Design a protein around this nucleic acid. Sequence first.
DNA 1: CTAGTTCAAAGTTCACA
DNA 2: TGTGAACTTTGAACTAG
Lengths: 84, 76
Amino acid sequence: GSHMFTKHICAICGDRSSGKHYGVYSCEGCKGFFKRTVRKDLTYTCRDNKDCLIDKRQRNRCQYCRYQKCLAMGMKREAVQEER
Amino acid sequence: HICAICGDRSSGKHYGVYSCEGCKGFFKRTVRKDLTYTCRDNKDCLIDKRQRNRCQYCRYQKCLAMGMKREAVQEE
DNA sequence: CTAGTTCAAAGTTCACA
DNA sequence: TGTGAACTTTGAACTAG
Ligand SMILES: [Zn+2]
Ligand SMILES: [Zn+2]
Ligand SMILES: [Zn+2]
Ligand SMILES: [Zn+2]
């Protein structure tokens, strides 16, 4: 055999996870995206058909689909706090 | 028991006052590092569970007004 | 006597076509 | 523009005895 060092991946985009953010294992990108969205109650529109692939290379291509994938994966809006 | 500073659930007496783990930690740190804050608004920010972290000056002042004593916190 | 600590998960910044 | 890597506080859980 061989020794295993624990790696977590983003449940939104499959990128390497910096830990759990807002209730789910996510990267710094998806954490920041979700924060900014929730902070100003931003709403987006999918230019395609609400089924855009959300991965490291595609995540920035559709804010709508990225946001719905955050919620579908269990990211909690109530875990986003007020400004400091 | 409720936290006399923010109204959250109190974990018991801390530095003379019934407070939450948040106000304990925040008061401990403020004293240790001898921190000075400045209010962003008008020295009368509402301090409660959801708003406690919005202004450190008004929280520290509510910590003193509710009776927290600096001399209770360990120095170095 | 009536205190102490840790560190994940909250926060915020700022370089870049 | 809006992103995300790299940073600063916070507070739930727990410590010694
Ligand atoms: Zn991600
Ligand atoms: Zn889409
Ligand atoms: Zn409190
Ligand atoms: Zn204030």
